[PDB]
Structures are given as C-alpha cells and as structure tokens.
Amino acid sequence: HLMLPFITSYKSVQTTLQTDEVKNVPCGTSGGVMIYFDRIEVVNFLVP
Amino acid sequence: ELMEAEKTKLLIAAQKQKVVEKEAETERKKAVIEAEKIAQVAKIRFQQKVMEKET
C-alpha cells in the first residue's frame, strides 16, 4: 500500500487471534491469605 | 495465616483418623491370633493332663 510521503504515519493493528499475559497477580482469599497467580494469559481477537 | 493452617490441619486429622483405625485393627487381629494360639496350646496341654491322670 502507498500513503503520503512524510506527513502520514501508519501503524498495523492485529485483527487475528493474539495472546498476552500478566505475571504475579495477587489474589486475596476469603480467609485473609494472599496467593499469587504466576501467570494469567488472555487470548483475544478484534473483528476487522 | 494461622486460621488457614487450622483449616488444613483438619484435613490431616481426617486421614490420621483412618491411619490410626487401620493400626488399631492390625493390633486387634494380632491379639486375636495370639488368643487362638493360647487356646490351642491349652487344648494340647489339657489332653496331656488327661493322659497324666490316666497314668
């Protein structure tokens, strides 16, 4: 594809299935004890 | 944290219960076997006693 030479900036956003994670997520149980999930991954996709 | 340790020490107790039950059952079986041994030895000894009295 072609755009204007210098006054236009393109960025490509993914519209297919992709994944990303967050590490060491705290979680406080009803007993007052704290447990840390090592990893929580979310896989999502965006319609075009 | 101690409160949560208690919630788990209850689970350990529910298994120690089975373990001690099995150990007590084993002791009961051993004691019953020993009692039967005593009974049979007594039977032999008393047959011997009858023979002694005849002689």
Description:
This is part of a larger assembly, with chains A (48 residues) and B (55 residues). Chain A is mostly beta strands. Chain A is built from no helices and 2 strands. Chain A has strands at 18-28, 34-44. In chain A, strand 1 and strand 2 (34-44) form a beta hairpin. The radius of gyration of chain A is 20 Å and the shape is elongated. Chain B has 55 residues and is mostly helical. Chain B is 96% helix and 0% strand. Chain B has one helix spanning 2-54. The longest helix of chain B has 53 residues, at 2-54. Chain B is rod-shaped. Chain B: It is found in: Endoplasmic reticulum membrane. Chain B: Forms a heteromeric complex with ERLIN2. In complex with ERLIN2, interacts with RNF170. Interacts with AMFR and SYVN1. Chain B: It comes from Homo sapiens. Chain B: This is Erlin-1. Chain B: Belongs to the band 7/mec-2 family.
In short:
The PDB classes it as membrane protein. Keywords: spfh, ER, Erlin1, Erlin2, membrane protein. This is part of a larger assembly, with chains A (48 residues) and B (55 residues). By secondary structure, chain A is an all-beta fold.
Kindly list the characteristics that best describe this protein.
part of a larger assembly, 2 chains, A: 48 residues, mainly beta, two-stranded antiparallel sheet, 2 strands, 46% strand, B: 55 residues, mainly alpha, 1 helix, rod-shaped, Erlin-2 (chain A), Erlin-1 (chain B), membrane protein, spfh, ER
- Termini separation of chain B (Å)? 80 Å
Count up the helices of chain A. Answer: 0
How would the global form of chain A be characterised? elongated
The chain pair forming the largest interface, with residue counts per chain, is: A-B, 4 and 4 residues
Q: SSE string of chain A, helix = H, strand = E?
A: EE
Question: Could you tell me the radius of gyration of chain A in angstroms?
Answer: 20 Å
- Please tally the helical runs of chain B, counting DSSP H or I stretches of 4 or more residues: 1
Biggest sheet statistics of chain B: none
Q: What order do the helices and strands of chain B follow? A: H
Helix content of chain B: over 70%
Protein name (chain B): Erlin-1
Organism (chain B): Homo sapiens (Human)
Subunit structure (chain B): Forms a heteromeric complex with ERLIN2. In complex with ERLIN2, interacts with RNF170. Interacts with AMFR and SYVN1.
Family (chain B): Belongs to the band 7/mec-2 family.
